[PDB]
Design a protein around this ligand. Structure first.
Ligand SMILES: O=[N+]([O-])c1ccccc1
Ligand SMILES: O=[N+]([O-])c1ccccc1
Ligand SMILES: [Cl-]
Ligand SMILES: [Cl-]
Lengths: 106, 106
């Protein structure tokens, strides 16, 4: 919920889409929401993020999206390596049937 | 490249990630960029969009992302039905090895 961004170098939009496995319960999705909200890896290079559960509007969709806007490849690497981020990946990993990602220049 | 948004109802972030088939050439990706830029289905409910090719930063990523922020399910449906949108889907469809999508509440 922000609010104009300013990148010093190349702005990178990271996206990951998740498809849950059979293991996953609504409370676990709530856990993922809590984790993404409190472990955001909010380094200065992370300018904006958004995430949420699929709204059920299209047959065949995946279940969940996370988007993170990062200032530069150095920003992106620092984000990947940040402890918050490794803790969040850890929470999600056992829940995944699939994950597809792209990073593009914003 | 905008710039604070205002939704009258529920803001919906649509995301689609594409994985090209063997058919696809760099010039065709350029065609997709041109199409998404000139056929955006820019109804009043479409508040913001972004799209681009994957930057090659992570082994196993998909090839291309499009993101569209829509005001309400009525916005989302009007967008799906807009001629620009049907023309863009038409261009992309033959190029796809896979497509994964989510819509979430922004
Ligand atoms: O890319 N990811 O899979 C991801 C990104 C941010 C937080 C947790 C997971
Ligand atoms: O969701 N999509 O596949 C899509 C969205 C917008 C423009 C073209 C294709
Ligand atoms: Cl943080
Ligand atoms: Cl338009």
């Amino acid at each position: 919920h922000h609010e104009n961004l300013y990148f010093q170098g190349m702005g990178i939009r990271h996206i990951a889409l998740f498809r849950w496995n059979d293991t996953v319960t609504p409370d676990q999705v709530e856990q993922v929401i809590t984790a993404l909200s409190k472990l955001p890896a909010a380094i200065p290079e992370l300018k904006n993020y958004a995430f949420g559960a699929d709204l059920g509007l299209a047959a065949g969709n995946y279940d969940f999206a996370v988007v993170a806007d990062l200032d530069g490849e150095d920003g992106f690497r620092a984000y990947q390596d940040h402890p918050d981020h490794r803790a969040a990946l850890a929470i999600i990993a056992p829940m995944l049937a699939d994950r597809v990602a792209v990073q593009f220049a914003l």
